[PDB]
Amino acid sequence: ETILEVNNVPTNATSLMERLRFPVSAQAGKGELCAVFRADPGRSGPWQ
Amino acid sequence: DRVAQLTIGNSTITTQEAANIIVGYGEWPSYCSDSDATRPDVSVNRFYTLDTKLWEKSSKGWYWKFPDVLTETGVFGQNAQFHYLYRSGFCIHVQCNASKFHQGALLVAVLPEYVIGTVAGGTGTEDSHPPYKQTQPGADGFELQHPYVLDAGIPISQLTVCPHQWINLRTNNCATIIVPYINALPFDSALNHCNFGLLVVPISPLDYDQGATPVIPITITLAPMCSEFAGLRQAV
Amino acid sequence: DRVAQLTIGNSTITTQEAANIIVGYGEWPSYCSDSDATRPDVSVNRFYTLDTKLWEKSSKGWYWKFPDVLTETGVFGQNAQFHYLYRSGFCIHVQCNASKFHQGALLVAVLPEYVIGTVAGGTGTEDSHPPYKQTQPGADGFELQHPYVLDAGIPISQLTVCPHQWINLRTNNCATIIVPYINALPFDSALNHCNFGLLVVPISPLDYDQGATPVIPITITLAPMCSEFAGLRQAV
Amino acid sequence: HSTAETTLDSFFSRAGLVGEIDLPLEPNGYANWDIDITGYAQMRRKVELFTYMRFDAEFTFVACTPTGEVVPQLLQYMFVPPGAPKPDSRESLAWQTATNPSVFVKLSDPPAQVSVPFMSPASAYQWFYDGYPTFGEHKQEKDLEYGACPNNMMGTFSVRTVGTSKSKYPLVVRIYMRMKHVRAWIPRPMRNQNYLFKANPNYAGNSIKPTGASRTAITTL
């Protein structure tokens, strides 16, 4: 088990640690999409 | 879930045993009975409780380096300066204390041979190396500069390959790792060869509503295991 | 009190089993072996999780109508348009999620043949009847207008005669009712004869201190039981 | 120890006033009484306490003048089963079809009574058919598709005088009805708001009223 970089924002290197985390808040609410990602390690590359 | 009553030698801690308790490398610490090819019994074996480092909202991590952390402070520290050769195990027990109203995962992990590296810059020069006060930080430890690469060009994303245990204040507030002696030689100098380095890195940063104590502590309590020394030197 | 691991077919829920778990009419759902005087096995049997309706401070209630709720959406929905005759059971599981700092009892109850009625008015005319979008509301459901009489001249005060289970966020946050097939005929059309209607009515209205999320959700997860169909029609 | 008063058959088996038929001298000369367990404007609430019901029923006919005088006329009561045609006029074949049972009694004779079995194609009666008639799936038109399961049609009662020449005596025919062998099923909570229409539980939304009486405050009597 290793950490899966899903969030992809290098702004600039200070926020680089925000690549390992999801955002979960109250608003706006139900039904809207939270986050998605590919299902192939080889592809570049949140799996990288 | 259980009440707390843990003590050794003279020292006494107050821990818990409600979740997964202990993680090892797959090998308990032991003695040695070889050709190289002292056994302190009931004195070294005391829970040395380090200095509780605080944890702000905008922290990036900390890292201690064994056996330097203790080598210049404590009864164990004594048996490191006078002796020249060293070998031991450790009972590291990290516990942070906060309400249910706080949050913020931590990554307790041990990276053997944590060779560190600082930034090239300063004047326009090309090469530089970290001072003695960063490679051998001591009890106080040292808050590292660039977490994501562990000040070593090494992504945290893959640190879990080493013994680790997650601290999510939602579920668990305790972490305990037991580390055996890991070296190419069965014995080495405690002064000039810092082995594995424990490090604590927050991934989900602490958040809370305000006016709720913005600082939750990090209690580090550790204890040597199967310590062993050989030849000794004279005192000052 | 227990951890959660519940799954069927492909779907997977995360529920609990710490209080009274299930309430039935006194009769489990079954098949039929009569003279009238298809048996989908491991496909229909999946927890269809409806759309989580929110719950404001000033709500009055909601009501879905089986089997219309699902009849026009989902794999089960497919086997309702093509077939003409219908019979099934249901594993309704209502769960609302909120802190210990919220409050507000709910009334989960099933009223078979929930014939509804709207208000006479509008123009000065005497008679009117609810549109197709209120007698067969579908998954989204429909927030009713006059709770106390259930939009049917029927006082809520006596609804508990039907299978019910109370949700008081003090104690329990889960409700689960199992309903068998109830009809004068062992088989009827799923399109034009909506049987029992589930309904959720808050009696003690939700209250909280402010700036504490004024909206707690209502998760509806349901699953058919002992479903059965007979003759089929051709597709579009 | 006795809880028999609270049995369905002790709660329903009472002959009630259901039909009031006027046969005057000076409307067209006959009448057809659509059977409705209502009429006795109390039975609907007592019945919609339950949803599914089953029963045999006993009808009784009290006939007299508006004066109350008893006069030697010969009446004809006719039960017209569901689906079967109703009498178009006084001389339609519906009186002679004989399929439709007929009861010929005088008034000097005591009230004629006949029993009527449970007459639904369904296994039991319904007071609620949340859904649409067989088989609703085309255009609207709408004004018929509510709370009505015509499978619950109990038939009709028809009366003559009898022919050929119209009577001389002004008549009223009282129709009394009682259930027997009753079996109800899944229980409904009892009505609280006033009725408005038959065969649909609509209510006056403008005027919702509390179920029972009220006090000035909770702490008072």
Resolution of the model in angstroms? 3.8
Residue D54's alpha-carbon distances to B124, C20, C26, in angstroms, are 100, 35, 21
CATH numbers and ranges of domains, chain B: 1-236 (2.60.120.20)
Q: After which residues is chain C broken (C to N over 2.5 A)?
A: 37
B161 CB near a chain A CB, below 8 Å? yes
CB D80 within 8 A of CB D155: yes
User: In 10 A of CB A37, how many CB atoms?
Assistant: 12
Classify residue D141 by its DSSP letter.
-
Q: Which chain C residues touch D186 with a CB distance below 8 Å?
A: 112, 162, 182
Residues C68, C139 contacting (CB under 8 angstroms): no
Residues in chain D: 221
- Judged by CB atoms closer than 8 Å, whether chains meet at C215 and A31 is answered as no
Whether the CB-CB separation of D56 and D118 falls below 8 Å is answered with: yes
Name chain C contacts of A31, Cβ cutoff 8 Å. Answer: 51
In this complex, do C51 and A31 lie within 8 Å of one another by their Cβ atoms? yes
User: Which one, of D18, D21, D22, lies nearest residue D40 by Cα?
Assistant: D18
Gap between the terminal Cα atoms of chain C? 50
Which among C120, C135, C161 is the nearest to D189, CB-wise?
C161
- Residue B43 and residue B223: Cα distance in Å, rounded? 11
Q: How far is D25 from D19, CA to CA, in rounded Å?
A: 20
Chain A contact for B156 (CB, 8 A cutoff): yes
**Residue D33 to residue D132: CA distance in whole angstroms:** 26
Contact D180, D13 (CB under 8 A): yes
Cβ-based burial of B1 (10 A; exposed 0-12, middle 13-18, buried ≥19): exposed
| Non-local CB neighbours of C175 within 8 Å, separated by 6+ positions | C93, C94, C95, C106, C108, C165, C166, C167
* Chain C positions in Cβ-Cβ contact with residue D129 (cut-off 8 Å): 113, 115, 193
User: To the nearest whole angstrom, how far is the Cα of C141 from the nearest Cα of chain A?
Assistant: 16
Partner chains of B (3+ C-beta pairs under 8 Å) = A
Q: Is B157–A5 a contact, with Cβ atoms under 8 angstroms apart?
A: yes
CA-based nearest residue to B17, from B166, B164, B165, B174: B174
The candidate with the shortest Cα–Cα distance to B74, out of B39, B53, B38, B44, is B44
The set of residues, in sequence order, having a beta carbon less than 8 Å from that of B190 and lying 6+ positions away, is: B67, B71, B80, B83, B86
Chains that touch A (3 or more CB pairs under 8 A): B, C
Peptide bond into C214 cis (omega under 30): no
- Nearest by CB: B160 against A1, A5, A21: A1
Query: How far apart are the C-alpha atoms of C114 and D52, rounded to whole Å?
Result: 13
Q: Across the interface, do C112 and D186 touch by the CB < 8 Å criterion?
A: yes
SS3 of D56-96: the string is: EEEEEEEEECCCCCCCCCEEEEEEECCCCCCCCCCCCHHHC
Cβ separation of D135 and C195 shorter than 8 Å?
no
Specify whether the CB–CB gap between C3 and C13 falls below 8 A.
Answer: no
Distances (CA, A) of C46 to C23, C225, D136: 20, 10, 29
CA–CA separation, B28 vs D175, rounded Å? 97
Closest Cα in chain A to B105 = A21
Residue B28 CB neighbour total at 10 angstroms: 11
What is the experimental method?
X-ray
> A5 and B147: CB-CB below 8 Å?
no
Return d(Cα B136, Cα B147) in angstroms, integer: 18
Instruction: Name the DSSP class of B83.
Output: B
Contact D136 C192 (CB under 8 A): yes
Alpha-carbon dihedral sign for residues B223, B226, B228, B234:
positive
For the record, the structure tokens of C173 come out as 């946050």
What the block records as the tokens of C3 is 């951890």
Query: DSSP per residue over B11-51, as a string?
Result: EEE----SS---EESSS------S-------TTT-S-EE--
| Whole-number Cα distances in Å, B66 to B112, B175, C185 | 9, 17, 79
Helix residue ranges, H only, B89-224: 132-135
Return d(Cα B91, Cα B82) in angstroms, integer: 23
Is the Cβ–Cβ distance between D92 and D112 less than 8 Å? no
Nearest C-alpha neighbor of A30 from the set C52, B160, D208 = C52
Looking at residue B188, the DSSP 8-state letter turns out to be: B
CB of A10 within 8 Å of a chain B CB? The answer is: no
* D175 contacts D181 by C-beta, under 8 angstroms: no
Chain C CB contacts of D133 below 8 Å: 192
Tokens 């085309």 sit at which residue? D138
Chain C environment of D188 (Cβ under 8 Å): 111, 154, 161
Contact flag C52-A29 (C-beta cutoff 8 Å): no
Q: What is the DSSP string of C106-123?
A: EEEEEESS-----BS-SS
> Collapsing DSSP states into helix, strand and coil, what is residue C8?
strand
Ordered by where they begin, the domains of chain D are 1-221 (2.60.120.20)
Phi first, then psi, for residue A16 (nearest 5°) are -55, -30
Please give the structure tokens belonging to residue D8: 């369905």
Token pair 């005087």 in the structure block, residue: C37
| Pairs of residues, one from chain A and one from chain C, whose beta carbons lie less than 8 Å apart | 8
Identify any residues that bridge with B142 across adjacent strands, giving them in sequence order: B63
Q: Position of tokens 């949340």?
A: D130
* All residues at 6 or more sequence positions from D183 whose CB lies less than 8 Å from its CB, including other chains: D8, D53, D54, D55, D124
Chains D and A touch (3+ CB pairs under 8 A): no
DSSP state of D191: P
Of B147, B159, B161, the CB nearest to A17: B147
Task: Evaluate the CA torsion angle B150, B152, B155, B156 in order and state its sign.
Answer: negative
> For B48-102, what is the HEC assignment?
EECCCECCCCCCCCEECCCCHHHHCCCHHHHHHHCECCEEEEEEEEEEECCCCCC
Phi first, then psi: what are they for C177, rounded to 5°? -125, 140
Contact predicate B20/B178, CB 8 Å: no
Determine the Cα–Cα distance for residues D118 and B179; give it in Å rounded to an integer.
85
Spatial distance between the Cα atoms of A26 and C213, rounded to a whole number of angstroms: 8
From residue C155, alpha-carbon distances to C151, D12, D70, D188, D193 in Å are: 9, 23, 48, 10, 8
How many angstroms separate the Cα of B201 from the Cα of each of B2, B67, B158, C183? 28, 20, 13, 63
Q: Which residues fall within 8 angstroms of residue A47, CB to CB, at 6 or more apart? A: A4, A5, A38, A40, A41
Which tokens is C206 given? Answer: 């939700």
* Dist CA B73 CA B70 (whole Å): 5
Of the candidates C77, C54, C137, B95, the one whose C-alpha atom is nearest the C-alpha of residue A28 is C54
Torsion of CA D31, D37, D40, D41, to 10 degrees: -110
> Nearest CA to CA, how far is A33 from chain B (Å)?
21
Residue A20 to residue B161, Cβ atoms within 8 A = no
Strands (E), chain C: 6-8, 11-13, 23-24, 48-49, 62-63, 87-96, 106-111, 164-167, 174-179, 197-202, 218-222, 224-228
